[PDB]
Curated annotation (Swiss-Prot), chain B:
UniProt comment concerning the protein's domains: The holoenzyme may undergo conformational shifts upon DNA binding: the nuclease domain of RecB may swing away from the DNA exit tunnel in RecC. When Chi DNA binds to the RecC tunnel, the nuclease domain may then swing back to its original position (that seen in crystal structures), allowing it to nick the DNA 3' of the Chi site and then rotate to load RecA. At high Mg(2+) the nuclease domain may swing back more frequently, explaining differences seen in assays performed at high Mg(2+).
Role according to the record: A helicase/nuclease that prepares dsDNA breaks (DSB) for recombinational DNA repair. Binds to DSBs and unwinds DNA via a rapid (>1 kb/second) and highly processive (>30 kb) ATP-dependent bidirectional helicase. Unwinds dsDNA until it encounters a Chi (crossover hotspot instigator, 5'-GCTGGTGG-3') sequence from the 3' direction. Cuts ssDNA a few nucleotides 3' to Chi site, by nicking one strand or switching the strand degraded (depending on the reaction conditions). The properties and activities of the enzyme are changed at Chi.
Subunit structure, interactors included: Heterotrimer of RecB, RecC and RecD. All subunits contribute to DNA-binding. Interacts with YgbT (Cas1). (Microbial infection) Lambda virus GamS protein interacts with the enzyme without displacing any of the subunits.
Protein name as catalogued: RecBCD enzyme subunit RecC
Residues of the full protein shown: 812 to 935 of 1122
Swiss-Prot record, chain D:
Complex and partners: Heterotrimer of RecB, RecC and RecD. All subunits contribute to DNA-binding. The C-terminus interacts with RecA. Interacts with YgbT (Cas1).
Whole-protein residues included: 148 to 196 of 1180
Protein family: Belongs to the helicase family. UvrD subfamily.
Protein name per UniProt: RecBCD enzyme subunit RecB
Biological classification of the source: Bacteria, Pseudomonadati, Pseudomonadota, Gammaproteobacteria, Enterobacterales
Domain remarks in the Swiss-Prot or TrEMBL record: The N-terminal DNA-binding domain (residues 1-929) is a ssDNA-dependent ATPase and has ATP-dependent 3'-5' helicase function; both are stimulated in the presence of RecC, suggesting this domain interacts with RecC. Holoenzyme reconstituted with this RecB N-terminal fragment has no nuclease activity. The C-terminal domain (residues 928-1180) has weak ssDNA endonuclease activity as an isolated fragment. RecD probably interacts with this domain. The C-terminal domain interacts with RecA, facilitating its loading onto ssDNA. Interaction is decreased by ATP.
Domain of life: Bacteria
Observed effect of gene inactivation: Decreased degradation of DNA with free ends that is unable to undergo homologous recombination, which can fortuitously lead to more efficient viral infection. Cells are deficient in DNA recombination repair and have increased sensitivity to UV light. The cultures have many inviable cells. Cells cannot be transformed with retron Ec48-containing plasmids.
Other known facts: In the RecBCD complex, RecB has a slow 3'-5' helicase, an exonuclease activity and loads RecA onto ssDNA, RecD has a fast 5'-3' helicase activity while RecC stimulates the ATPase and processivity of the RecB helicase and contributes to recognition of the Chi site.
Swiss-Prot record, chain F:
Enzymatic reactions: Couples ATP hydrolysis with the unwinding of duplex DNA at the replication fork by translocating in the 5'-3' direction. This creates two antiparallel DNA single strands (ssDNA). The leading ssDNA polymer is the template for DNA polymerase III holoenzyme which synthesizes a continuous strand; ATP + H2O = ADP + phosphate + H(+)
Chain's role: A helicase/nuclease that prepares dsDNA breaks (DSB) for recombinational DNA repair. Binds to DSBs and unwinds DNA via a rapid (>1 kb/second) and highly processive (>30 kb) ATP-dependent bidirectional helicase. Unwinds dsDNA until it encounters a Chi (crossover hotspot instigator, 5'-GCTGGTGG-3') sequence from the 3' direction. Cuts ssDNA a few nucleotides 3' to Chi site, by nicking one strand or switching the strand degraded (depending on the reaction conditions). The properties and activities of the enzyme are changed at Chi.
GO biological process: DNA damage response; DNA recombination; double-strand break repair via homologous recombination; recombinational repair
Protein name (Swiss-Prot/TrEMBL): RecBCD enzyme subunit RecD
Family membership noted in the UniProt record: Belongs to the RecD family.
Summary of subunit composition and partner proteins: Heterotrimer of RecB, RecC and RecD. All subunits contribute to DNA-binding.
The keyword Plastid belongs to this UniProt entry's keyword annotation: no
Molecular function GO terms recorded: 5'-3' DNA helicase activity; ATP binding; ATP hydrolysis activity; DNA binding; exodeoxyribonuclease V activity; helicase activity; single-stranded DNA helicase activity
Keywords, ordered alphabetically: ATP-binding, DNA damage, DNA repair, DNA-binding, Exonuclease, Helicase, Hydrolase, Isomerase, Nuclease, Nucleotide-binding
Part of the full-length chain shown: 204 to 606 of 608
Length: 61, 124, 246, 49, 147, 403
DNA sequence: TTTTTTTTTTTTGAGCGACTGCACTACAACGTTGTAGTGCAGTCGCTCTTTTTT
């Protein structure tokens, strides 16, 4: 549960940044699809990143 | 209050994968997949207006200008070129701050780019 | 050069006019204009304003000065107000008058306020700001916020349990506790359990009755995010964002 | 008798701060401007102070 | 609604979740206790810092009184042993540096058990306390109606 | 250099390469499309930075650049710096054609040495290659440039029997040779009409009505727009200036007033989109398929007033008049803007005011613009002064190539 | 005096202060060895209120 909470914290930190760093969610291409980040689309993005971005960190050294 | 709501933008479109798909298309796809779905499939590119002219001279370096200066300084220091000539070139265009502050900025950027080049050209 | 003026520039010009020698006679013209002054909200008084009002209405006969204010509400020190000007005014004047009766809240909340702020002497840590026990109204002595179980008390200090906690975790836990209390008051309020009772009259608690008092924008956004997760819509009254930034 | 009230005063304040930084921080030598840069990056930090 | 925007308004039920959060003033800009004039100390003298922190604490107490005196029927407070210091477990908490803990702990530094005993000391029919429970069962019911 | 010349090159090489017998691997190596020089090098609207400026050259084996007469010196220098050390470049264009747009004359200063001839070894090499008798050039100044050049003199679409080629040969000679060429028997190809006063202007408008007679006959009969465009593409006026009594907008407004006078074209004063107006585009538009210098005819097919354009593929496209980015009346085109196009019956109109635009190359491009029939409306002194005054451009290529 | 054309983004927090681990000497117990206090270095949280006057 601790890693499942820290991954949600990292996802909310990287999607919407602080008041000094522009986050990834502040973009004209993501606001057209959805206005508010629903947890269903969040889990869909998580599943797609687990399907595709896994060899990025698997072969990283 | 008798109207239909906004349906979802996501719809299953017919698409046939061609024979010859170049590497540049895959790079533009995997740089941003939603942008490549927008500006290439439906050809919708949201063209934002250009930034206005600032009212004063640049006292600091931040954003795209600092990144371009760091890129040119790293491309100059990777060949062990004269950093002072590029300093005079950037000072002749007015992109650097006036007087000593531009020299301090160029000195700290040259220190950072030399620290990066000592790792870059170590295995080149 | 441009000939423009500002809000504080009027005060500075009037203070420089009364600072001169002939302008004192101009103050007599003000004593010819209005031989009285009733100044409301004297806690939000700049020192230039009090210097002007002392230049005009210090000790002249037939002219009256009535400074109606409250030192316990001077919260605009960021804007330019200052409580030391009010303390100088209290040291300068001789008579003091106070309002005993309170007509807004229930007597339970009044007794809670008079109990919390009268624990020690000089709770506002200044000698010239004394606290007095106010009295509740006779017409509002039957106000009761009743729950499903019994009569809920006035002040409920939700003590978060633990030895030491951070800032973000404490804010998140208290926002979740506040959202749980809001959804418990709204879920039981739509069934006729949680009520506001004036004597025998009853009223169900809607979503507009409960209000969260915050101090900053980050904790307000934290409260709004913790409340919109439980399917509870909330408005931000202090939202000063421009419509052109959407 | 007639004057024009302005709502925002931050623009003229920033202009006067930029004029002060021009007439004070430009002719300094390197050994003083190093300390001035260590205190504030520009006139914006001085105005914020 | 913020505390400054709630001056003079009226609300039935008021919740104050972050009334214990405080911020320490760093700059030395105070007022003299005799001349009542604004004194700006450019040097880092400890007396000017203490005289500015006293005015900051008085402003926080006035904000606490403003936020407390806006409830009509019920007000709820969020109390916690908040520590502004970077040490996690140092044996003492910074609630005495806030506005609420100056009235709860009577202006004295204590611990979490001391804060709990100071909370439980002033227990009346109007003032009660309860622990913070983390839990959610269901969001809400819409109960919409036709037009 | 231009998109319209690129479209003409694509359609010409498409209709030319399918005639010759090829193989299955040879049809795979057919050139796909012709690109603009600003599109091949990757020019941006904001910045002048190219994609293949100095670092990465274009990955090409052979590069055929058509119409090098419209290539200025900076575009030539930007094309040179983009080429690798193994690509072979073939330049196309005419030597006596009109000069470049900006400052510079690359193709003329290159082909000025084509009149000297080849080398003594290169003549024997070409005789061994072609198997015929190739003449040799006297002297040797720059053997590489004189060997790389070639001169085409035998024209196939017109011979010595047609007066167009004889007039083009007499343009480069003295003006009295052109007067003699127009004078004796006119070769049944070139007519000369004197334009001095208002009655000559009315006669010129009457001869333009006689030239646009088949176009108006197909317009009034409510026929298909393809034959209307094909009849409009046979007669064309060529003017020098833009405004005034002698120019584009002057001749256009006078022709519109003459169509308002005589019962040839019905025009509403507030509609601005009457049936039968010729328009031309000023900016390129690859999305609509129309380029700069393309003609369109606005008419009513039955669904409303739409502008029909003749595509080089052989079809016709009906576009809404609101979909046109630019539109200017093209009853008379300028000689600079009519390059690349071809017209069957051309009529040159020169202004009476002395201007440096009317020179030898302008009259040469007005002569070569006509396929079969050419008319002239100018004074004798202006035609005598335009031939002698050649648009010379002083450049250092005459001294740099000589050493 | 005339005329040519072009569609690709990129970047962005750093000083303050703690947590943890390794190394080095001081000092006492058993010349040598184990425990404690302090210094240096890599890593990570965190954090930057409130508003209205003609």
């Amino acid at each position: 549960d601790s890693t499942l909470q820290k991954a949600r914290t990292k996802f909310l930190q990287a999607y919407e940044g602080n008041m000094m760093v522009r986050g990834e969610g502040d973009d004209i291409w993501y606001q057209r699809l959805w206005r508010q980040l629903t947890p269903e689309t969040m889990e869909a993005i998580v599943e797609q990143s687990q399907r595709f971005l896994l060899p990025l960190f698997r072969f990283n050294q | 209050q008798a109207g239909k709501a906004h349906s979802e933008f996501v719809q299953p479109l017919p698409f046939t994968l061609p024979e010859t798909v170049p590497l540049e298309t895959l790079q533009r796809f995997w740089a941003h997949p939603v942008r490549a779905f927008f500006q290439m499939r439906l050809q919708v590119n949201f063209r934002t207006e250009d930034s206005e002219i600032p009212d004063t001279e640049p006292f600091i370096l931040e954003g795209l200008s600092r990144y371009q200066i760091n890129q040119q300084l790293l491309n100059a220091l990777v060949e062990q070129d004269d950093a002072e000539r590029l300093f005079r070139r950037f000072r002749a265009a007015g992109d650097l701050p006036y007087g000593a502050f531009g020299e301090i900025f160029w000195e700290t950027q040259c220190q950072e780019m030399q620290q990066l080049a000592d790792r870059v050209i170590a295995c080149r | 050069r441009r000939g423009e003026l500002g809000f504080d520039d009027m005060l500075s010009r009037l203070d420089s006019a009364l600072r001169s020698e002939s302008g004192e006679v101009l103050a007599a013209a003000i004593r010819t204009r209005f031989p009285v002054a009733m100044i409301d909200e004297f806690q939000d008084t700049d020192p230039q304003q009090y210097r002007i009002f002392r230049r005009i209405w210090h000790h002249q006969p037939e002219t009256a000065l009535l400074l109606i204010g409250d030192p316990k509400q001077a919260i605009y020190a960021f804007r330019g107000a200052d409580i030391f000007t009010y303390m100088k005014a209290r040291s300068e004047v001789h008579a003091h008058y106070t309002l005993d009766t309170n007509w807004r809240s229930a007597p339970g909340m009044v007794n809670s306020v008079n109990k919390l702020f009268s624990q020690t002497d000089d709770a506002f840590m200044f000698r010239e700001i004394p606290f007095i026990p106010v009295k509740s109204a006779g017409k509002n002595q039957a106000l009761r916020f009743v729950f499903k179980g019994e009569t809920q008390p006035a002040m409920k200090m939700w003590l978060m349990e633990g030895e030491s906690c951070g800032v973000g975790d404490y804010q998140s836990t208290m926002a979740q506790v506040c959202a749980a209390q809001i959804r418990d008051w709204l879920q039981a309020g739509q069934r006729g359990e949680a009520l506001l009772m004036n004597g025998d009259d009853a009223r169900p608690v809607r979503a507009s009755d409960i209000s969260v008092l915050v101090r900053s924008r980050q904790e307000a956004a934290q409260v709004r995010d913790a409340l919109t997760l439980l399917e509870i819509p909330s408005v931000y009254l202090s939202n000063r964002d421009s419509v052109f930034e959407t | 008798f007639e004057q024009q009230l302005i709502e925002d005063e931050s623009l003229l304040r920033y202009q006067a701060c930029a004029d002060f930084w021009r007439r004070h921080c430009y002719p300094l030598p390197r050994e003083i401007a190093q300390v001035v840069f260590e205190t504030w990056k520009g006139p914006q930090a001085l105005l914020r102070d | 609604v913020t505390i400054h925007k709630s001056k003079g308004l009226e609300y039935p039920l008021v919740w104050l979740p972050f009334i214990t959060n405080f911020r320490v003033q760093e700059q030395a800009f105070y007022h003299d206790r005799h001349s009542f004039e604004a004194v700006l100390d450019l040097n880092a003298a400890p007396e000017s810092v203490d005289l500015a922190e006293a005015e900051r604490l008085a402003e926080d107490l006035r904000l606490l009184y403003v936020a407390l005196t806006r409830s009509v029927w019920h007000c709820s407070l969020g109390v916690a042993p908040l520590v502004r210091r970077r040490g996690d477990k140092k044996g003492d908490t910074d609630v005495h540096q806030s506005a609420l803990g100056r009235l709860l702990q009577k202006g004295e530094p204590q611990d979490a058990a001391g804060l709990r005993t100071c909370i439980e000391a002033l227990c009346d029919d109007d003032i009660a306390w309860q622990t913070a429970q983390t839990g959610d069962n269901q969001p809400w019911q819409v109960n919409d109606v036709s037009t | 250099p231009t998109g319209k010349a690129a479209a003409r090159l694509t359609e010409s090489l498409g209709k030319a390469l399918r005639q010759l017998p090829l193989t299955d691997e040879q049809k795979k190596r057919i050139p796909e499309d012709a690109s603009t020089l600003h599109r091949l090098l990757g020019a941006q609207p904001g910045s002048q930075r190219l994609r293949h400026h100095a670092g990465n050259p274009l990955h090409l084996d052979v590069l055929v650049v058509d119409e090098a007469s419209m290539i200025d010196l900076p575009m030539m220098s930007r094309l040179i710096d983009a080429l690798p050390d193994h690509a072979r470049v073939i330049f196309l264009g005419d030597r006596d054609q009109l000069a470049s747009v900006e400052a510079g004359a690359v193709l003329g200063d290159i082909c000025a040495y084509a009149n000297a001839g080849f080398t003594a070894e290169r003549a024997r090499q070409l005789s061994r290659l072609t198997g015929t008798h190739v003449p040799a050039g006297t002297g040797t100044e720059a053997a590489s440039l004189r060997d790389s050049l070639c001169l085409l003199q035998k024209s196939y679409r017109f011979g010595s029997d047609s007066g167009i080629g004889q007039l083009a040969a007499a343009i480069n000679r003295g003006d009295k040779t052109a007067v003699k060429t127009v004078f004796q028997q006119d070769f049944t190809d070139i007519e000369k009409r004197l334009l001095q006063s208002g009655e000559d202007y009315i006669a010129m408008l009457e001869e333009a009505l006689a030239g646009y007679g088949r176009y108006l006959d197909l317009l009034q009969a409510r026929a298909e727009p393809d034959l209307i465009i094909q009849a409009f593409n046979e007669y064309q006026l060529l003017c020098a200036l833009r405004e005034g009594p002698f120019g584009v907008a002057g001749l256009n407004e006078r022709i519109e007033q003459f169509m308002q006078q005589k019962r040839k074209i019905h025009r509403h004063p507030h509609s601005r989109w009457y049936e039968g107006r010729p328009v031309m585009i000023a900016r390129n538009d690859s999305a609509l398929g129309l380029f700069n210098g393309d003609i369109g005819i606005a008419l009513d097919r039955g669904q409303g007033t739409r502008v029909w354009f003749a595509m080089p593929d052989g079809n016709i496209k009906s576009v809404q008049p609101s979909r046109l980015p630019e539109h200017e009346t093209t009853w008379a085109m300028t000689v600079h803007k009519s390059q690349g196009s071809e017209f069957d019956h051309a009529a040159l109109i020169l202004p009476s005011q002395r201007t440096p635009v009317v020179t030898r190359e302008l009259v040469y491009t007005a002569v070569t613009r006509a396929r079969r029939r050419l008319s002239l409306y100018a004074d004798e002194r202006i035609l005598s002064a335009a031939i002698a005054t050649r648009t010379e451009r002083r450049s250092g290529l005459a001294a740099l190539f000589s050493s």
